[PDB]
């Protein structure tokens, strides 16, 4: 996998180039913004069980078909699998947030997932709805102004939304 | 690519776990050290040409035969001189990359993996490159923790060639 | 035991490698964060009795049946009250240990491994302990990064019970 | 394995105790001294190839029997094994220095090593002489006053000598 | 799905062997026991509604807080009451299925696998379900070997929740 | 795999339903008929070596091309493979008879078999002829009126023919 | 492993002998008594979780040292291991009851267990006390006169006590 | 040794599980079938000598060369006649053991494992033994389910030799 | 197919190595021995019909029952006589192939693999074929090293059937 | 794999035939020519490192794009892989020369290689140019008239060219 | 140790088989080639000192810096000259051993395994040894197949260093 | 393993010495005698099945206890194991004959065999009697003067007896 710094290096290396002042500046800015990124990861991780549970409870309230006998989340084995997938997706999104790059999410989680669900008969559209609900909950938790030194994390929130949106698109 | 951030993620992912504070502390350490590391990277980059030029000459002074001996593995032709300058510049670019990435990963992937094979197959002496690196370390002009950063990656390359 | 230092060593040792700057940065991050973590650990320790006492009562208020219902798994006897106070004190001691060690390792080894089995076998409700932990988080009196440290380990326990 | 902090916790846990103010103070002092420890590890690691090579060259100059035909370091396979062992020992000593505890050295390196050498017919006494030479070289490098902010690392050097002495005793 | 017949086949198939008399005896034992097992299954099915209704009330009587406490995991709303009645009916349907199939396979596949995870994630107490099951056992009205059959599968569920 | 009882349960579960009186009656009838099913399995299994050998000898007498040099059953390794396949097919048919359901036959034996033979160049049509001959022999043995309490096993014989026919269709 | 029938055969075979009328009679008597044995196994298995839990709760009430910090059942990992061992022992005793022979218990459970506990520092004497408590509970459950056709299971209870006593002696 | 009871235990033990009703049904099937199986075992035992004697002669009649041909593998000497009678008695004793144990385990362990190797090495024809077994089946004098039991184990041996 | 040349290659290839002199010596040994081996192969081929005919009769003389006994596995019909002559010719063709290839590979692949299974399933006696082979060895008419070659492969077949 | 002798046998066996005098003669001629074949293999193998190195140096002088940053032989890991492939190809060609048959080359080396390179983005055309250069060097070394008993190895050289040409076509 | 005889045995032993003619041919090839190989081995041995002395000087002439440059890895002191002569003699002794054993095994075990590691660690140039070996090949004085044998093992060493 | 040539080299190498003229002469003599050694190996291998069978039949005629019910060669599994061991021992002896050295026999066959038999309860003395009988049969076959160019193989026969004697001593 790549983080944000590794990604710039990799691009440089393929050109055979040293970095430019602009590229150094960009990386230095990433470092300058690092405490915010650490806070987002900590907050989301610290709330992971509720983010998942609450999104699952909401999905099944809105999409009762999934928990009727014959539905894809019926039986405890299928419900446990569904809950696990929600935890997995959220785990890999948080890795992407720490890294400042989507590569770990794409490579270790999203690649092949659409095909996995199609072979199983799991409805990827409904997965996308569970991801969106975790996204909204995660962002509200990461961006809560209470109990933190005040500042603007809007760019980071947009980046975090991106990662969730990418997961949703990969399964939908 | 091995960086403090990818090592942190990899640890959490091997264990099937969310990141914990154990990993977040590690990344914070990276972020704080990046101050010194970026200072080193910029300095080495800005002075790259003179360091490369001086390093090549350090090699030729230590090993005079490399300027006269017949064979395509030696710097006794314009092409061999150009290959050598190229290679020294590769080592220095990799050091800058390690400094930017906060770890050895760029050097490991782009230079160290297969190094021993290349040196053997093409009859290149590791001692040539060790000399170049020792010149860079002696003459980069850095001080304080920026120097400590640069030297850690230069010495890592030297160890890889020893 | 999982600490930033043992994770760093383990990484280097899996790879058969000397420590590199990648790992040393990680330990430095630990050492700098230890300032906040030790402040939290000392505070929680100094106020342990009141936090334990208050937390137990928070549980009994949230779950009144635990004070009246017949059975050895409930706090409806002096022995059950003592078991419960003991267990809350165990959770808080573990949080202090994680703060001292800079990671989850003490909690993981001494408390989380086998947790689910114990709760099932002895008919202990995870929700009891989640309530205790939420009281500690609300009432430890810490601020700034010491609070962030404490809460990270308290929330880790809560997640383990969810 | 344990580091210095984990060791105090483990002891505490076996007693069922919270730490004392004295124990907190001791750990805080360890943290306060951490830059020195990082410098020692960096210096020794950065010089690892020369520390090994120079100690090996000196051993074989003093103990020529080891490199005569029939000797335990004769043939390139046995010489490579001997050099590797010296690197291993130094690697595990440096882990112990970072950890501030000998457990990783004892558990992952020194346990069973005497028996390994006896089964092979490798002379553990000569190993101990190679360890001592690396010890003296490592300490001189870690404790070099040039090129570092001045201060007293004497206690750390005594601790580092300890680890090397422990390795030597385990094989001798 | 684990039944005496699929276990017999699986044994023969693991060994790459035709069925032998060893397996055919096992299936005969199943066929003879099916008399008692089908009697139990039909009885439980015919009386399912009253058993489910009575069992839910047994739970609410044992655990009164489940009727009043605020939260979606409790039976303090019409939706929670409906979820609980649903779940008890699931346990009883599974018992009937085990009786029909002559083994634990239906319960194992449709209910026990993932049980612990679900109870934890959704904050459902195993003791709730144990109480429901104990009511069914006490009140199913069966005697003789039909009772022994029913109780074996009810106790299997209870053990799974303990 | 599923047996006949498991199959009814599985269907029930997907609907969320308890069984009906008709379904209970059907299963009770299966149990009532069980001694016949056990006799069929015992008889066929007890004769398995002759059923296979005799069908193989007859196939190769009718289809000499298979045992001419260059033919797919020429060489002892290919003949042993062919004999083994006949034993396999008969083994899985007998499992299906005990289970009262074709699932074990389909899943563990017939799925992919056509493709296996095509990749090898084995003539699946000739396999189908060997299966038919085992079918006819098996039925004659299972349905022999001598040495058994008299009764009507015609429905069971029709079911047993079915399983053999299914195997034949899967390879032809 | 051996059951009671296999044990008689094995003995016969080592002598090269057919069974005697007395040996046939003994085995026939075992079969005659089989419903009692099945009831004992069913009863004990059906109560396994309470037999274990209740014996564990009683051990730790009597032997509080085991659950004090530093004690061998302190920490959830060690408590889970202890509970697991009690379940294991009871599981293997019930196998022995079904088989009518101790071989499965001896071979798959008790052999080496004393040495395992000694290496760990687990107090085998305290294990023996947990086994005795399960023995007494198991016997009371198996031999409960309520809810079963009346008869004398005293010989079987003596046999069942034997198996528990054998487990206790193997660890004490 | 493969018996219905050891197969039941082995299944439960592979899965780390207590015995369930699935296994207990299997053992009950064994216990009920033991009535027929013990009747067969006693009959074959009581008539063992005549069956062995008659079976050997059936072999010699089918295969006359075995009484005249020179070589230690044939029954053309008193020693060869004694080896053959011994071996037939071994097959019949094993059948009795399978009947007593309720499965193939005794035959599998004491006779079938290595059978092919022995027959090859010592130049013994499987067809000799198949003939002996076919005589026993034809002449044991059993009826009903006792016959079905005996014949299942005799045919199992025949299949092992084919 | 096992020949000295394919064994040499396989060794080098397992080790990821170029052929060395160790392997080239082995192939030279093959090439020199091929003189004797080809002489044997041509002789056996030229005299194949008489050897096959004589060998079949040797079998019938040793084992007279094979000419009279009823069953499709015996040579008591024109078809059985033809199967037997065919099979003897197969053994002799394989010997010629081993001689040409310089090793056992053709016999191993085309005849020995599955041999035991075929003989068992079709009730063919190994001793029949051993007799045929012993006749070929006695009557091939070869001398010197050509005989040694032929006999090595004939005895290899005999050992495979023993 | 097959050698030249095995190939004739295999063909014979599929027809059920003994060899003919012409086929015996052909094989005898192969044996007669064997010293030349051994010399070719020895010569080429003895020069393998220079054949590879010299062809690689020439390729990269002619095709500098391959060693520019971003090129497929840039970085030491990719250069080592490229050198390794050249060694592999030459190794398998020499096996084919010893065997007098291309089967080992086709089966163990060339099959799937085109697809491997396409998935990687390695330019198979440039591989073909490296193979051709090794071919020309190998032939010059094998066919050098100095230091060997004089004779005509032209047919063998044509066969050796064939194998190299086959490798080149498989990757191009 | 890799010799044609140990490779033959190893093949047979991997396969659990007796030696066959396939292996015996290989050993015969070894025995016939031993004539040339022993002639080479004796010649190289008899002329060892002059070859070693001449080879060392060839290295010093090709690489003059090795006689003057400061460092213990160079032949610029009496000790370094002695180490170098020693090492060349080691290479030549190994060639003699390979000739005696009929394969590369002695060189592989005593010299090639770990070679790359030693050359790197002690800063010895492979090109030094390649030059020595090329001198031996040029000047051993052998002809015919004895030369072919010697050169095969000398070129094997050269390839190992390239 | 070592052959006779490797053994001389190994000894030389431990001394750091080139071979002497006497050592060269000894090896040349071994090569000169090689056809005899090849004949012995061929003869014994070609007769391996009869050597084993005949020795087994003779052992059991002399030692009937081994094949009485309860005896160590009673049951077909134990008889097959015994026959296999005799084949193994003879196989490894023939390897030793080809190699001209006992190392392969010692290392891959005889080491630990005494302990194996003791753990099993197999009577190593009776094994030694089976080895002696194979020895005498093998020697008679290898040394048969019929059908071979006449010469003196007495030294080789003494060497072959040695290997068998060594096997016998290792198990007795
Ligand atoms: C160890 C395994 C095992 C076997 C093998 C078994 C067989 C078995 N078959 C039986 C009967 C029978 N078997 C058959 C079967 C047939 N009748 C015919 O005329 C047909 C052609 C045929 C076709 C399959 C019938 C009709 C009965 C009596 C009715 C019944 O009991 O279903 C009976 C009852 C007693 C008897 O009448 O002999 C048993 C015990 N039970 C077992 O536990």
Angle among Cα E36, E38, E43 to the nearest 5 degrees reads 100
Nearest to A85 by CA among E117, C156, C159: E117
Q: Please say whether the beta carbons of E36 and E144 come within 8 A.
A: yes
**Which residues in chain I touch residue J14, judged by CB atoms under 8 angstroms apart?**
none
Atom of ligand 1 nearest to the CA of F144: 21
What CA–CA distances, in Å, run from L34 to B136, K4, K21, K35, L99? 65, 14, 15, 12, 11
Atom of ligand 1 nearest to the CA of H32: 43
Structure tokens at B15: 């264990």
| Pocket (CB within 6 angstroms of ligand 1) | E 21, 24-25, 28; F 35-36, 38-40, 42, 142-143, 145, 148-151, 153, 156; H 33, 144-145, 148
Inspect the interface and report whether the beta carbons of D68 and L13 lie closer than 8 Å: no
Q: Please say whether the beta carbons of A130 and A63 come within 8 A.
A: no
Residues 6+ apart with CB under 8 A from G97: G37, G40, G41, G44, G159, G160, G163
CA A103/CA A95 separation, integer angstroms: 10
End-to-end CA distance of chain E: 23
CA H130/CA J164 separation, integer angstroms: 60
CA D160/CA D167 separation, integer angstroms: 11
**Per this entry, what is the length of chain A?**
172
Nearest to E8 by CA among E23, E21, E18, E22: E23
- Alpha helices, H only, I47-143: 48-62, 78-101, 105-107, 115-122, 126-139
Residues 6+ apart with CB under 8 A from E104: E2, E98, E153, E156, H20, H21, H22
């004089």: which residue's tokens? J150
CA D92/CA D158 separation, integer angstroms: 17
**Residue H104 Cα to chain centre, angstroms:** 8
**Per this entry, what is the length of chain E?**
162
**Per this entry, what is the length of chain I?**
162
Residue of chain J whose Cα is closest to the Cα of K157: J46
In the reported structure, the alpha carbon of residue F5 is separated from the centroid of ligand 1 by a whole-number distance in angstroms of: 21
Domain ranges of chain C: 1-162
Q: Is L153 helix (H, G, I), strand (E, B) or coil?
A: coil
What CA–CA distances, in Å, run from I65 to H56, H62, I122? 19, 11, 17
Q: Please say whether the beta carbons of H42 and H96 come within 8 A.
A: no
CA H78/CA H67 separation, integer angstroms: 10
Count helices and strands in chain I by DSSP H and E runs: 8, 0
Among E14, E25, E102, which would you mutate to test the H interface (most chain H Cβ atoms within 10 Å of its Cβ)? E25
CATH number at residue A137: 1.10.490.20
Write the DSSP assignment of H63-131 as a string of letters. -GGGGTS-STTSSSSHHHHHHHHHHHHHHHHHHHHHHHHTSSHHHIIIIITTHHHHHHHHT--HHHHHH
Residues 6+ apart with CB under 8 A from F122: F72, F116
CA I97/CA I114 separation, integer angstroms: 18
Q: Which of F142, F149, F150 to mutate to test the pocket of ligand 1 (most atoms within 8 A of CB)?
A: F149
Nearest to C18 by CA among L42, I28, D44, L138: D44
3-state secondary structure J17-33: CCCCHHHHHHHHHHHHC
Angle among Cα E40, E41, E46 to the nearest 5 degrees reads 100
Residues H3/H5/H10/H12 CA torsion (nearest 10 deg): 150
DSSP-assigned letter for residue D148? S
Chain L partners (3+ C-beta pairs within 8 A): D, G, H, I, K
**Which residues in chain F touch residue J16, judged by CB atoms under 8 angstroms apart?**
68-70
Inspect the interface and report whether the beta carbons of D15 and G70 lie closer than 8 Å: yes
Nearest to B73 by CA among B63, B81, B64, B85: B81
CA F57/CA F45 separation, integer angstroms: 19
CA C11/CA B8 separation, integer angstroms: 10
CA I140/CA I161 separation, integer angstroms: 20
Residue D70 Cα, gap to closest chain B Cα (Å): 27
Inspect the interface and report whether the beta carbons of A76 and E115 lie closer than 8 Å: yes
SS3 content of chain E, % helix, strand, coil (to 5): 80, 0, 20
CA F116/CA F104 separation, integer angstroms: 18
HSE of B29 in the Cβ direction (CA atoms, 13 Å)? 31
């199986």: which residue's tokens? H37
DSSP-assigned letter for residue J139? H
Inspect the interface and report whether the beta carbons of I110 and F81 lie closer than 8 Å: no
Structure tokens at K111: 């010299």
Residue range(s) defining the domain that contains residue A29: 1-172
CA E112/CA J98 separation, integer angstroms: 63
Q: Please say whether the beta carbons of K132 and K91 come within 8 A.
A: yes
Residue of chain K whose Cα is closest to the Cα of D51: K121
Residue F55 Cα, gap to closest chain H Cα (Å): 15
Residues 6+ apart with CB under 8 A from A54: A133, A137
Structure tokens at H51: 């069956």
Q: Please say whether the beta carbons of L70 and G14 come within 8 A.
A: yes
End-to-end CA distance of chain K: 23
Q: Please say whether the beta carbons of E152 and A117 come within 8 A.
A: no
Among protein residues, the one whose CA lies closest to atom 19 of ligand 1: F150
Q: Please say whether the beta carbons of E103 and H20 come within 8 A.
A: yes
Chain F partners (3+ C-beta pairs within 8 A): A, E, H, I, J
Q: Please say whether the beta carbons of L41 and K24 come within 8 A.
A: yes
Q: Please say whether the beta carbons of L1 and L98 come within 8 A.
A: no
Structure tokens at H161: 């030799």
Nearest to C104 by CA among A91, G77, D105, B24: B24
Q: Is J36 helix (H, G, I), strand (E, B) or coil?
A: helix
Inspect the interface and report whether the beta carbons of A13 and J69 lie closer than 8 Å: yes
Nearest to H156 by CA among H121, H125, H115: H115
- The neighbour count for residue B122, using CB atoms within 10 Å, is 16
- Alpha helices, H only, chain C: 4-14, 21-46, 48-62, 78-101, 105-107, 115-122, 126-139, 144-161
The dihedrals phi and psi of E19, each to the nearest 5 degrees, come to -60, 145
**Residue I5 Cα to chain centre, angstroms:** 20
Q: Please say whether the beta carbons of L128 and L171 come within 8 A.
A: yes
Among protein residues, the one whose CA lies closest to atom 33 of ligand 1: F35
| Chain L CB within 8 Å of residue K118 CB | no
Across chain G, which distance is largest between two alpha carbons, in Å?
61
> Domains in chain A: how many in total?
1
Structure tokens at C9: 């060593």
CA J60/CA C44 separation, integer angstroms: 67
CA I80/CA D25 separation, integer angstroms: 99
End-to-end CA distance of chain A: 24
Q: Please say whether the beta carbons of F100 and F4 come within 8 A.
A: yes
Q: Please say whether the beta carbons of H99 and H41 come within 8 A.
A: yes
| Chain I CB within 8 Å of residue H72 CB | no
Q: Please say whether the beta carbons of F2 and F99 come within 8 A.
A: yes
The dihedrals phi and psi of H156, each to the nearest 5 degrees, come to -60, -40
What CA–CA distances, in Å, run from H14 to E1, G163, H18, H20? 16, 21, 10, 13
CA D166/CA K51 separation, integer angstroms: 49
Residues 6+ apart with CB under 8 A from F145: none
CA A81/CA E118 separation, integer angstroms: 10
CA E34/CA E48 separation, integer angstroms: 20
**C1-162 has which CATH code?**
1.10.490.20
Write the DSSP assignment of B54-85 as a string of letters. HHHHHHHHH-GGGGTS-STTSSSSHHHHHHHH
Write the DSSP assignment of chain G as a string of letters. ---HHHHHHHHHHHHT-PPPHHHHHHHHHHHHTHHHHHHHHHHHHHTHHHHHHHHHHHHHHH-GGGGSTTSTT-SHHHHHHHHHHHHHHHHHHHHHHHHTSSHHHIIIIITTHHHHHHHHT--HHHHHHHHHHHHHHHHHHHT--TTS-----HHHHHHHHHHHHHHHHHH-
HSE of C111 in the Cβ direction (CA atoms, 13 Å)? 26
Q: Please say whether the beta carbons of G44 and G159 come within 8 A.
A: no
DSSP-assigned letter for residue C66? G
CA J75/CA I48 separation, integer angstroms: 64
| Chain J CB within 8 Å of residue I110 CB | yes
Residue D9, classified by CB atoms within 10 Å of its CB into exposed (0-12), middle (13-18) or buried (19+), is buried
| Chain J CB within 8 Å of residue B117 CB | yes
Nearest to I102 by CA among L45, K36, J99, L148: J99
Q: Please say whether the beta carbons of E104 and E4 come within 8 A.
A: no
Residue of chain D whose Cα is closest to the Cα of K109: D77
3-state secondary structure L97-131: HHHCCCHHHHHHHHCCHHHHHHHHCCCHHHHHHHH
What CA–CA distances, in Å, run from D19 to F101, H155, L62? 66, 76, 79
CA I77/CA I69 separation, integer angstroms: 9
Chain B partners (3+ C-beta pairs within 8 A): A, C, D, J, K
Inspect the interface and report whether the beta carbons of B28 and C33 lie closer than 8 Å: yes
Inspect the interface and report whether the beta carbons of A53 and E121 lie closer than 8 Å: yes
- The neighbour count for residue B46, using CB atoms within 10 Å, is 12
Q: Is B107 helix (H, G, I), strand (E, B) or coil?
A: helix
Nearest to L67 by CA among L116, L114, L130, L131: L130
CA J38/CA J149 separation, integer angstroms: 13
Q: Please say whether the beta carbons of G100 and G87 come within 8 A.
A: no
Nearest to L134 by CA among L169, L113, L164: L164
Write the DSSP assignment of F95-124 as a string of letters. HHHHHTSSHHHIIIIITTHHHHHHHHT--H
Name the interface residues of A facing B (CB cutoff 8 Å).
Answer: 1-3, 5-6, 8-10, 12-13, 16-19, 21, 24, 27-28, 31, 34, 38, 41-42, 45, 48, 91, 94-95, 98-99, 104, 108
CA E159/CA E129 separation, integer angstroms: 11
Residues 6+ apart with CB under 8 A from A117: A123, A124, A127, A171
Among protein residues, the one whose CA lies closest to atom 28 of ligand 1: F149
Q: Is C42 helix (H, G, I), strand (E, B) or coil?
A: helix
Atom of ligand 1 nearest to the CA of E28: 43
Among protein residues, the one whose CA lies closest to atom 39 of ligand 1: F35
F109 is in an annotated binding site: no
Structure tokens at I146: 């050509």
DSSP-assigned letter for residue L17? -
**Per this entry, what is the length of chain F?**
172
Residue of chain F whose Cα is closest to the Cα of I117: F80
What sign does the CA torsion over G53, G58, G60, G63 have?
Answer: negative
Structure tokens at E67: 């009727």
Structure tokens at H106: 């005794």
Q: What is the Cα gyration radius of chain K?
A: 18
Nearest to B56 by CA among B33, B34, B83, B79: B83
Residues I67/I68/I70/I73 CA torsion (nearest 10 deg): -10
CA H152/CA K46 separation, integer angstroms: 80
In the reported structure, the alpha carbon of residue H111 is separated from the centroid of ligand 1 by a whole-number distance in angstroms of: 30
**Which residues in chain I touch residue F75, judged by CB atoms under 8 angstroms apart?**
109-111, 113-114
In the reported structure, the alpha carbon of residue E28 is separated from the centroid of ligand 1 by a whole-number distance in angstroms of: 11
In the reported structure, the alpha carbon of residue F36 is separated from the centroid of ligand 1 by a whole-number distance in angstroms of: 5
Q: Please say whether the beta carbons of G99 and G1 come within 8 A.
A: yes
- E strand or H helix that includes residue D44: helix D34-46
Q: Please say whether the beta carbons of G51 and G141 come within 8 A.
A: yes
Residue of chain K whose Cα is closest to the Cα of L5: K101
Angle among Cα F155, F159, F162 to the nearest 5 degrees reads 140
Quoted resolution (Å): 1.4
Atom of ligand 1 nearest to the CA of F143: 21
In the reported structure, the alpha carbon of residue F32 is separated from the centroid of ligand 1 by a whole-number distance in angstroms of: 11
Residues 6+ apart with CB under 8 A from G101: G1, G2, G3, G4, G6, G7
In the reported structure, the alpha carbon of residue E22 is separated from the centroid of ligand 1 by a whole-number distance in angstroms of: 17
């Amino acid at each position: 996998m790549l983080d944000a710094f590794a990604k710039v290096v990799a691009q440089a290396d393929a050109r055979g180039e040293f970095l430019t002042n602009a590229q150094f500046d960009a990386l230095s800015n990433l470092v300058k913004e690092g405490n915010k990124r650490l806070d987002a990861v900590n907050r989301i991780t610290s709330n992971a069980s509720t983010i998942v549970a609450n999104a699952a409870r909401a999905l099944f309230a809105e999409q009762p078909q999934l928990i009727q006998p014959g539905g894809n989340a019926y039986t405890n084995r299928r419900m446990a699998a569904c809950l696990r997938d929600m935890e997995i997706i959220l785990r890999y999104v948080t890795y992407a947030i720490l890294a400042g790059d989507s590569s770990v999410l794409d490579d270790r989680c999203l690649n092949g997932l659409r095909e996995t669900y199609q072979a199983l008969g799991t409805p990827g559209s409904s997965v996308a709805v569970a991801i969106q609900k975790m996204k909204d909950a995660a962002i509200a938790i990461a961006n809560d102004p209470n109990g933190i030194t005040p500042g603007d994390c809007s760019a980071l929130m947009s980046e975090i939304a991106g990662y969730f949106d990418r997961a949703a698109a990969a399964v939908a | 690519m091995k960086t403090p951030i990818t090592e942190a993620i990899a640890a959490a992912d091997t264990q099937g776990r969310f990141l914990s504070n154990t990993e977040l502390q590690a990344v914070d350490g990276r972020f704080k050290r990046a101050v010194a590391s970026m200072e080193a990277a910029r300095a080495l980059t800005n002075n790259a040409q003179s360091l490369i030029d001086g390093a090549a000459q350090a090699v030729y002074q230590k090993f005079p035969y490399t300027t006269t001996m017949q064979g395509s593995q030696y710097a006794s032709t314009p092409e061999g001189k150009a290959k050598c300058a190229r290679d020294i510049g590769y080592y220095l670019r990799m050091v800058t990359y390690c400094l930017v990435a906060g770890g050895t990963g760029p050097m490991d992937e782009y230079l160290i993996a297969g190094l021993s094979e290349i040196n053997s197959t093409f009859d290149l002496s590791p001692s040539w490159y060790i000399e170049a690196l020792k010149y860079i370390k002696a003459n980069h002009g850095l001080t304080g923790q920026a120097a400590v950063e640069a030297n850690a990656y230069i010495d890592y390359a030297i160890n890889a060639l020893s």
